[PDB]
Design a protein around this ligand. Structure first.
Ligand SMILES: CCS(=O)(=O)N1CCC[C@@H]2CN3CCc4cc(OC)ccc4[C@@H]3C[C@@H]21
Length: 375
């Protein structure tokens, strides 16, 4: 059917190998670590097990129907083929939605939800998501469309809408509405410390380009107020630490040292020694960066929620134009055949793009993959 064929099937086999290899590496990395992975990561193996299931049981049949024609072998072929092909996409979307709800509840109610985060509760959520995904994916007896039954799903004007908002749109909307609240909560929690940090930076730049003792003295006084205010804050890395913790003591003592160096710089500035005060300002800038800047980072939980956020973003980016045009055809809109094919082709390669996100943005997953590969 195509001018060249071996190139496309080698491409698809390359894609299937990447999906299987990456997702089975994720599953092994999650299950083999000695208390390094939590039950809240059980969803990551279900989403991974779905990606493997979509690489060995979904994309090869579509590849064959694309090159050799839609030669489905039996009516049960298109039946289970379209059923599992929609089930895996629906289960992936609802798994991402349940993950976003898991992060939201773990943030809002730490102690309470941590007590209800048992592996039994997580396994029950996974089974429930799989069950409701199989229910939503199952159509009301309108299966497809047995001599030459091309695996082309039915396109009812009022079934396309139900299936799309039941699989993609509702989970994506809910998970987006969840992560925007996660983003707002994080920024509201770090706003005051970021304000004090930006005040310290602006007054340091003022002293950098200052030319008289009045400017540097004023900036140092405002820095003293900013440093004392930031000292009473809780940095993002130490968000779950005690006041007697050595890092919290180091954070407090670091701003104590910064205030002391500001007092010394003010003693220099009041004597008219502008250049000496500016040099002391550069020294306390380095001291502040060396003492505090490591605590401005997020903890492991916040970094992983960001990783799951960009995973949701990749999932939406891969599947949105497909559902968008597939819904547009229901209300009377024209789309090219090759373009309409490549739109869900972007959704297929999401299964292989999912494991590599962990290697890019996470250090534990990348270390576990390196450990499995090296030894
Ligand atoms: C040519 C008819 S098709 O275009 O329908 N073709 C049938 C074979 C499988 C192909 C890829 N799968 C990806 C998952 C998916 C989910 C849907 O709702 C969630 C709806 C369709 C599909 C498509 C159908 C597509």
């Amino acid at each position: 059917s195509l001018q060249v064929t071996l190139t496309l099937v080698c491409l698809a086999g390359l894609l299937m190998l990447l999906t299987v290899f990456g997702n089975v590496l994720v599953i092994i990395a999650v299950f083999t670590s000695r208390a390094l992975k939590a039950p809240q990561n059980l969803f990551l193996v279900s989403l991974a097990s779905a990606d493997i299931l979509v690489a060995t049981l979904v994309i090869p049949f579509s590849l064959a129907n694309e090159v050799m024609g839609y030669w489905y072998f039996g009516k049960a072929w298109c039946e289970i083929y379209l059923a599992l092909d929609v089930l895996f996409c629906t289960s992936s979307a609802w798994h991402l939605c349940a993950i976003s709800l898991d992060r939201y509840w773990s943030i809002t109610q730490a102690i309470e939800y941590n007590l209800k985060r048992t592996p039994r509760r997580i396994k029950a959520i996974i089974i429930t998501v799989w069950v409701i995904s199989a229910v939503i994916s199952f159509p009301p007896l309108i299966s497809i469309e047995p001599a030459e039954p091309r695996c082309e799903i039915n396109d009812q004007k009022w079934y396309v809408i139900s299936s799309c908002i039941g699989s993609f749109f509702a989970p994506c909307l809910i998970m987006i509405l969840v992560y925007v609240r996660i983003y707002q909560i994080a920024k509201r929690r770090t706003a005051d410390l970021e304000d004090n940090w930006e005040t310290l930076n602006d007054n340091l730049k003022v002293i950098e380009k200052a030319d008289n003792a009045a400017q540097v003295k004023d900036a140092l006084t405002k820095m003293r107020a900013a440093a004392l205010d930031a000292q009473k804050a809780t940095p993002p890395k130490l968000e779950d630490k005690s006041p007697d913790s050595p890092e919290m003591k180091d954070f407090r003592h670091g701003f104590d040292i910064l205030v002391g160096q500001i007092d010394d710089a003010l003693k220099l500035a009041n004597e008219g020694k502008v250049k000496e005060a500016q040099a002391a300002a550069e020294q306390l800038k380095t001291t502040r960066n060396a003492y505090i800047q490591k605590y401005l980072r997020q903890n492991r939980e916040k970094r992983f929620t960001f990783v799951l956020a960009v995973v949701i973003g990749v999932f939406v980016v891969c599947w949105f134009p497909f559902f968008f045009t597939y819904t547009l055809t229901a209300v009377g809109c024209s789309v090219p055949r090759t373009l309409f094919k490549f739109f869900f082709w972007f959704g297929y390669c999401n299964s292989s793009l999912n494991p590599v996100i962990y290697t890019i943005f996470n250090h534990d997953f990348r270390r576990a993959f390196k450990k499995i590969l090296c030894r």
